[PDB]
Design an enzyme around this catalytic site. Structure first.
Site, PDB file in Angstrom:
ATOM      1  N   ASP A  43       2.792  85.864 -28.649  1.00  0.00           N
ATOM      2  CA  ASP A  43       1.279  85.829 -28.101  1.00  0.00           C
ATOM      3  C   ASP A  43       1.597  85.996 -26.600  1.00  0.00           C
ATOM      4  OD1 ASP A  43      -1.306  86.065 -28.251  1.00  0.00           O
ATOM      5  OD2 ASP A  43      -1.532  84.148 -29.318  1.00  0.00           O
ATOM      6  N   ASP A  45      -1.919  85.230 -24.079  1.00  0.00           N
ATOM      7  CA  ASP A  45      -2.853  84.467 -23.621  1.00  0.00           C
ATOM      8  C   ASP A  45      -2.467  82.891 -23.877  1.00  0.00           C
ATOM      9  OD1 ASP A  45      -5.054  86.347 -22.292  1.00  0.00           O
ATOM     10  OD2 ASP A  45      -5.618  86.573 -24.333  1.00  0.00           O
ATOM     11  N   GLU A  90     -14.764  78.502 -34.988  1.00  0.00           N
ATOM     12  CA  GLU A  90     -13.293  78.512 -34.983  1.00  0.00           C
ATOM     13  C   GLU A  90     -12.871  77.186 -35.305  1.00  0.00           C
ATOM     14  OE1 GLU A  90     -12.005  79.968 -31.638  1.00  0.00           O
ATOM     15  OE2 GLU A  90      -9.831  79.880 -32.148  1.00  0.00           O
ATOM     16  N   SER A 111     -18.907  90.357 -28.253  1.00  0.00           N
ATOM     17  CA  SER A 111     -18.662  90.158 -26.913  1.00  0.00           C
ATOM     18  C   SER A 111     -18.188  91.291 -26.094  1.00  0.00           C
ATOM     19  CB  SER A 111     -17.681  88.781 -26.775  1.00  0.00           C
ATOM     20  OG  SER A 111     -16.152  89.237 -27.117  1.00  0.00           O
ATOM     21  N   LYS A 207      -3.505  88.087 -37.923  1.00  0.00           N
ATOM     22  CA  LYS A 207      -2.213  88.481 -37.232  1.00  0.00           C
ATOM     23  C   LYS A 207      -1.211  88.985 -38.496  1.00  0.00           C
ATOM     24  CE  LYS A 207      -2.651  87.353 -32.614  1.00  0.00           C
ATOM     25  NZ  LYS A 207      -1.799  86.628 -31.305  1.00  0.00           N
TER      26      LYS A 207
END
Ligand SMILES: [Pb+2]
EC number: 3.1.3.5
Length: 291
Positions: A43, A45, A90, A111, A207
């Site tokens: 990943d 971030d 979430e 968003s 993912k």
């Protein structure tokens, strides 16, 4: 032979490992296979970038646009409200992960939709990134540098914004030939202005789907049956589902947040858990022995 007790990087108090004998066994396999068998799946971030600096909370790829001079305060007010209502979903402990998918799709769509409204030129991303407060983890030059030197494949698999991510690593000097980026890429119009996103949405919970739709990449890498995976979420454990053959896989998880709630779950699922850790020195220590 591998001894975690003799690796000073593994003694840092941020390092949590449920099963050290097992971890030693995996790292031992990694070393035996050498460069020829290795690949990295990661990943971005809060994994390759910092969660916080001094003493500050660092931006994600998405945050970089959220916060830039091209986006209005009212747009940020709307973005924040979206975050407040969808992040509660979430992190909701009752809902199954599968129940959360539709909500996650709604969040990234809404968003992204607000940012498409703001008018983001491709031409401006360079400057937006340069002006931003983004930070790569301590030890990133070494990380990317040893990898490129040995030609180790690095598959960065991100639910962020790919154009942003690429500009961060490019400006950092570490976007080398061995680095492949799979993310949410912006779709631009005739004028080079953002109008939407390319492909299927990658979010935190799907993912596995993306991992499977990258068959070409993984089958060229059949021989790289030793994997280091790095992630900051439960969702990131699926990033290696596309891998042809696995001999040894090491899963290293950054636990940045919700530490008390999630520690036990992370320790159960990742081999090594790094608690509020802003560097890559544990992974660098393993590359050092391996490469
Ligand atoms: Pb993640």
């Amino acid at each position: 032979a591998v001894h975690l007790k003799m690796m000073p990087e593994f003694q840092k108090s941020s390092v949590r490992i449920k099963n050290p004998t097992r971890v030693e066994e995996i790292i031992c396999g990694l070393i035996k296979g050498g460069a020829a068998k290795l690949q990295i799946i990661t990943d971005f971030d809060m994994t390759l970038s910092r969660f916080s600096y001094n003493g500050k909370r660092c931006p994600t790829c998405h945050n970089i646009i959220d916060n830039c001079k091209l986006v209005t305060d009212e747009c940020r007010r709307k973005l924040l409200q979206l975050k407040e209502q969808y992040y509660a979903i979430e992190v909701d402990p009752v809902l199954t992960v599968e129940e959360k998918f539709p909500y996650m799709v709604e969040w990234y769509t809404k968003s992204h939709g607000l940012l498409i409204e703001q008018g983001i030129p491709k031409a401006k991303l360079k400057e937006i990134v340069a002006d931003s407060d983004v930070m790569l983890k301590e030890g990133y030059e070494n990380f990317f540098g040893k990898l490129q030197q040995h030609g180790i494949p690095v598959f960065i698999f991100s639910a962020g914004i790919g154009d942003v991510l690429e500009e961060v690593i490019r400006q950092a000097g570490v976007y080398h030939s061995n680095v492949k980026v799979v993310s949410n890429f912006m779709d631009f119009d005739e004028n080079g202005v953002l109008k939407g996103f390319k492909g299927e949405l990658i979010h935190v919970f799907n993912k596995h789907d993306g991992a499977l739709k990258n068959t070409d990449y993984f089958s060229q890498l059949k021989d790289n049956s030793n994997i280091i995976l790095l992630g900051d979420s439960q969702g990131d454990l699926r990033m290696a589902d596309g891998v042809a053959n696995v001999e040894h896989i090491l899963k290293i998880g950054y636990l940045n947040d919700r530490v008390d709630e999630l520690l036990e779950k992370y320790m159960d699922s990742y081999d090594i858990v790094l608690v509020k850790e802003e560097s890559l020195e544990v992974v660098n220590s393993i590359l050092q022995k391996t490469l």
